[PDB]
Amino acid sequence: RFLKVKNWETEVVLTDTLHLKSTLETGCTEYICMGSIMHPPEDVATKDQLFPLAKEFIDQYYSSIKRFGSKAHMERLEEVNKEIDTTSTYQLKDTELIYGAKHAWRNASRCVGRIQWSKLQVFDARDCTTAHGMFNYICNHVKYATNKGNLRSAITIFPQRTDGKHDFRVWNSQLIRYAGYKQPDGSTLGDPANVQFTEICIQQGWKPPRGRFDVLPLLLQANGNDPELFQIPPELVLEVPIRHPKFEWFKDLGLKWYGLPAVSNMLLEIGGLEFSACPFSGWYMGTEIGVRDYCDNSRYNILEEVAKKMNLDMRKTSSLWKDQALVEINIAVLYSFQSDKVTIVDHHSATESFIKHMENEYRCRGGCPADWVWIVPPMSGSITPVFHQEMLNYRLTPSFEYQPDPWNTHVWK
Amino acid sequence: FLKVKNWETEVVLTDTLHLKSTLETGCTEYICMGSIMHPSQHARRPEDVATKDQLFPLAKEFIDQYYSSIKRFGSKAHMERLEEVNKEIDTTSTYQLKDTELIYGAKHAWRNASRCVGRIQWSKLQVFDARDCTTAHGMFNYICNHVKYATNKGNLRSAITIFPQRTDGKHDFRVWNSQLIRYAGYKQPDGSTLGDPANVQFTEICIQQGWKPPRGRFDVLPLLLQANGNDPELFQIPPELVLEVPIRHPKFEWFKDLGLKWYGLPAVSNMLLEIGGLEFSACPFSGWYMGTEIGVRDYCDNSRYNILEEVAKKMNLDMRKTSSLWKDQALVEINIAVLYSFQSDKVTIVDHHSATESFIKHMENEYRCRGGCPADWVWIVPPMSGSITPVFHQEMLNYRLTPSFEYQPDPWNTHVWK
Ligand code: HEM
Ligand code: HEM
Ligand SMILES: Cc1cc(N)nc(-c2cc(CN3CCC(F)(F)CC3)cc(F)c2F)c1
Numbered sequence: 001r002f003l004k005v006k007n008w009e010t011e012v013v014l015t016d017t018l019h020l021k022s023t024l025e026t027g028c029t030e031y032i033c034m035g036s037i038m039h040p041p042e043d044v045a046t047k048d049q050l051f052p053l054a055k056e057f058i059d060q061y062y063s064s065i066k067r068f069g070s071k072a073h074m075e076r077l078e079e080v081n082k083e084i085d086t087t088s089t090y091q092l093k094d095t096e097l098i099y100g101a102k103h104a105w106r107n108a109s110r111c112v113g114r115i116q117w118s119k120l121q122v123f124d125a126r127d128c129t130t131a132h133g134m135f136n137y138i139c140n141h142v143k144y145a146t147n148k149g150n151l152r153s154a155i156t157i158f159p160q161r162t163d164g165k166h167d168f169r170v171w172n173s174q175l176i177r178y179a180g181y182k183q184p185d186g187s188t189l190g191d192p193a194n195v196q197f198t199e200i201c202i203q204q205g206w207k208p209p210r211g212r213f214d215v216l217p218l219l220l221q222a223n224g225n226d227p228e229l230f231q232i233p234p235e236l237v238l239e240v241p242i243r244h245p246k247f248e249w250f251k252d253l254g255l256k257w258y259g260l261p262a263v264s265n266m267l268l269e270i271g272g273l274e275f276s277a278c279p280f281s282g283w284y285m286g287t288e289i290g291v292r293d294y295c296d297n298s299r300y301n302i303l304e305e306v307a308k309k310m311n312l313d314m315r316k317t318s319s320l321w322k323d324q325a326l327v328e329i330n331i332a333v334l335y336s337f338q339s340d341k342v343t344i345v346d347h348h349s350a351t352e353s354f355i356k357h358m359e360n361e362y363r364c365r366g367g368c369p370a371d372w373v374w375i376v377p378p379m380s381g382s383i384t385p386v387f388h389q390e391m392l393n394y395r396l397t398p399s400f401e402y403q404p405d406p407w408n409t410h411v412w413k
Numbered sequence: 414f415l416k417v418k419n420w421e422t423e424v425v426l427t428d429t430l431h432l433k434s435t436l437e438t439g440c441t442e443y444i445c446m447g448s449i450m451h452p453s454q455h456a457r458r459p460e461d462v463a464t465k466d467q468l469f470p471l472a473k474e475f476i477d478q479y480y481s482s483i484k485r486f487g488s489k490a491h492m493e494r495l496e497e498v499n500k501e502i503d504t505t506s507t508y509q510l511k512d513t514e515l516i517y518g519a520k521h522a523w524r525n526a527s528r529c530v531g532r533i534q535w536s537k538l539q540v541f542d543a544r545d546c547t548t549a550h551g552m553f554n555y556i557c558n559h560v561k562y563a564t565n566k567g568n569l570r571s572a573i574t575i576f577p578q579r580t581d582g583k584h585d586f587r588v589w590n591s592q593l594i595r596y597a598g599y600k601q602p603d604g605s606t607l608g609d610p611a612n613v614q615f616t617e618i619c620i621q622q623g624w625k626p627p628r629g630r631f632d633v634l635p636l637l638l639q640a641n642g643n644d645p646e647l648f649q650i651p652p653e654l655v656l657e658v659p660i661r662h663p664k665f666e667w668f669k670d671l672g673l674k675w676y677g678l679p680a681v682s683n684m685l686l687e688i689g690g691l692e693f694s695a696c697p698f699s700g701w702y703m704g705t706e707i708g709v710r711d712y713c714d715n716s717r718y719n720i721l722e723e724v725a726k727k728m729n730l731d732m733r734k735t736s737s738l739w740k741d742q743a744l745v746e747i748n749i750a751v752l753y754s755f756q757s758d759k760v761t762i763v764d765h766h767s768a769t770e771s772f773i774k775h776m777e778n779e780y781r782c783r784g785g786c787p788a789d790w791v792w793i794v795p796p797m798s799g800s801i802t803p804v805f806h807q808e809m810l811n812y813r814l815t816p817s818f819e820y821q822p823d824p825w826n827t828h829v830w831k
């Protein structure tokens with residue numbers, strides 16, 4: 001009936017009642033925790049499956065606006081039911097769509113940026129029918145979100161799933177990523193994470209510049225048709241050349257990154273409806289770029305390069321040359337974005353804000369599901385306040401969800 | 414049967430050992446509690462002296478496990494041990510472990526410690542039977558020998574000293590210190606805190622028991638030892654047994670002038686060791702430090718020594734905003750310094766890269782021969798530079814195997830004085 005979480009640095013204790021509203025698996029059992037497991041078409045919901053999911057969401061939406069039990073609430077409910085009876089599915093109103101998209105972000109236990117959840121620009125693209133249409137919608141998203149460096153968070157929602165045979169999909173995992181090319185000598189040019197997607201693009205006819213920071217083309221699928229290539233207009237892709245405020249040589253590494261993090265491979269679930277193409281964007285925390293993108297061994301792997309220029313002893317790990325070069329890379333990233341007036345947040349500010357957000361969510365909502373394994377930044381963990389903050393993890397809906405990669409299930413026409 | 418995947422190597426391991434899990438983790442299908450410090454209160458035995466139907470099944474299970482370990486099970490010595498444990502509980506409401514059973518159980522408690530990154534060495538543990546102990550003086554003698562053996566003039570060795578098991582609950586043996594060696598914390602009149610803030614309350618009890626504090630920043634605390642439920646007694650560990658390392662920096666000549674030191678021997682002394690239903694309330698165990706425990710947590714936690722600003726100021730760092738990452742930069746230098754100092758003084762220490770790499774290897778070993786290895790991601794990943802260590806990218810399954818080390822309440826919330 002109640003659960004308590006404690007911050008071990010501050011002694012603050014919060015009481016989670018909201019977890020009673022969750023209704024879907026975490027992956028754990030009573031005797032084994034799967035808290036660190038990353039992921040613990042005909043599966044479209046039947047009529048009888050969809051009825052209670054829509055009732056739940058419509059009830060939740062009318063509760064949120066202090067109209068529960070109202071005439072408008074009850075008529076909406078039977079209107080939804082009629083659609084499900086006739087058409088085996090239903091259509092959200094614009095208000096419900098905006099509410100669902102904002103709450104799916106609010107409910108994202110792994111996102112540390114949720115203090116901003118209520119300031120989200122929703123772009124209703126449910127009238128889209130072609131890949132060309134999707135490209136137009138996505139170009140307008142990118143230009144709005146980027147806002148000349150003064151980033152604004154936003155989502156564009158494409159038509160919901162029907163029978164699973166007519167999905168809309170953004171095949172890109174983000175709207176802006178760099179290409180990756182495996183060389184014959186075993187080495188990799190560009191971003192090793194995107195090698196397979198780069199190969200899918202090329203075979204579809206993309207002519208790659210074969211460089212280190214080639215912005216990839218969009219690969220867009222509408223209504224279950226084969227996906228199509230489109231080149232984002234270069235003037236819409238804002239990029240930051242990475243330099244260091246004290247190390248003159250750092251600009252000579254030749255590094256840049258894009259300004260706009262825009263995840264496009266997830267699935268938005270509102271009231272049992274599945275929005276298979278729903279790309280969303282915000283702004284970066286510095287460590288996403290500085291620690292993971294640049295320094296993962298499977299990613300750009302520049303630690304060794306930077307330590308060399310730093311003149312560090314790299315013969316023994318206990319010199320902490322890796323830790324040292326990592327801090328400088330992350331200083332360079334934050335300094336570069338700030339100098340070019342492109343929105344960014346360091347891990348300290350971001351985690352402190354999330355703690356403020358968590359306490360408020362407990363205050364007014366009864367809790368706030370949170371995934372410690374993801375909330376804690378990938379460097380300097382215990383000197384950030386979330387490290388010392390107990391967190392409960394559960395799955396509320398609307399939610400953002402993973403889905404399989406399109407090329408693992410699409411059958412080509 | 415569950416799989417775990419490492420996302421750096423794509424190695425996938427397959428866990429069947431979790432089918433032997435006994436106690437609740439705290440999680441359910443609908444709520445994960447994997448970042449709660451004490452998620453469960455599910456114990457294997459009720460409050461005080463258990464009835465025969467309560468203790469015997471736990472006993473039978475441990476003995477079954479142990480004889481299974483040595484390729485008996487059903488052997489003559491196994492069936493006689495069952496009858497011996499049964500007659501013993503019938504006649505005393507408890508039973509006593511053979512020497513071999515005690516050693517097997519302590520080593521497997523360590524092997525089962527999901528939060529411990531050090532378990533590659535689990536089977537190389539020195540076990541000191543102190544179950545004949547009767548007084549706090551005896552407990553001090555045993556602890557001194559432990560510390561001396563374990564320290565080994567800086568070539569540290571792993572050890573545990575096991576004092577008599579809990580009988581009725583009003584006769585517990587307890588080390589009141591949380592570790593055998595810690596520094597005092599003193600509440601200053603101006604509201605600040607001198608020494609280690611974590612130990613302010615234990616330091617007060619010591620002072621309140623007659624300890625004369627030297628009132629410094631690194632005052633080794635006295636032992637506060639409780640035998641057979643009686644009042645605890647203060648003892649000063651002979652200083653020549655308390656190895657300490659003065660912290661200096663391989664490049665910053667000014668670092669030594671910060672006047673920082675730490676001790677060499679981490680010896681956890683407030684935990685409970687549970688073997689076949691038996692509860693060893695006093696079982697101090699020790700190994701050697703991972704550098705980050707001292708340099709990240711002990712020195713840089715806000716509720717601890719909090720030395721970040723002072724090191725950052727000495728380094729001439731832009732301390733007016735977070736985004737300069739001055740905290741992160743000082744943090745790295747401190748950990749370079751702690752490591753360099755322990756190594757210069759030839760005192761055993763391991764950095765977080767070496768230690769996490771070893772644990773991945775231990776994991777591969779455990780799955781290969783045991784069918785799994787319980788591990789708590791939240792505690793295994795180091796508190797700096799997490800994602801540049803291999804355990805960050807390693808999925809882990811957490812579950813509670815027995816024998817185990819458990820938490821227990823601080824004795825001063827529970828003890829009736831006399
Ligand atoms: C406004 C600034 C934002 C910041 C600073 C931020 C920060 C982060 C970070 C650091 C992660 C982990 C990413 C990783 O480590 O790979 C994350 C995850 C996530 N973000 Fe946010 N985020 C922001 C905005 C948004 C928005 C606008 C949405 C949706 C409308 C969103 C939805 C999510 C989701 C669903 C995840 C987790 C995906 C998963 O489960 O893997 N975020 N966020
Ligand atoms: C020999 C080298 C060892 C290393 C490097 C090591 C490392 C660690 C570290 C870093 C932690 C986390 C502590 C914290 O962050 O507060 C830990 C936890 C733990 N260690 Fe080990 N350890 C070692 C030996 C041992 C031994 C000999 C035992 C018992 C016989 C043991 C039992 C435990 C237990 C039970 C925990 C969890 C304590 C808790 O749940 O609060 N360790 N270890
Ligand atoms: C809006 C937003 C802001 C921000 N700073 N960051 C992200 C983000 C989120 C993921 C999570 N992401 C899910 C898809 C996946 F493919 F499953 C892999 C994990 C990954 C990233 F690279 C990201 F930049 C998103």
Ligand SMILES: Cc1cc(N)nc(-c2cc(CN3CCC(F)(F)CC3)cc(F)c2F)c1
Pocket residue numbers: 591679680681683684698699700701702703706820
């Ligand atoms: C043998 C050993 C080696 C090593 N390198 N480290 C530790 C250790 C373990 C904790 C865990 N500790 C338990 C008591 C508690 F009260 F439960 C709070 C958590 C704390 C430390 F400071 C520690 F040095 C132990």
Ligand SMILES: C[C@H](O)[C@H](O)[C@H]1CNc2nc(N)[nH]c(=O)c2N1
Pocket residue numbers: 036037038373374375420805806807808809
């Ligand atoms: C194995 C582990 O689950 C995996 O590395 C997780 C850990 N925590 C993370 N946290 C964030 N923010 N992003 C990640 O990709 C991961 N990866």
Ligand SMILES: C[C@H](O)[C@H](O)[C@H]1CNc2nc(N)[nH]c(=O)c2N1
Pocket residue numbers: 008387388389390391448449450791792793
């Ligand atoms: C809230 C969180 O569970 C708590 O701060 C944990 C996190 N992980 C940890 N990991 C280690 N090794 N030691 C700790 O004390 C903690 N503290």
Ligand SMILES: [Zn+2]
Pocket residue numbers: 028032033034035440444445446447
């Ligand atoms: Zn769990």
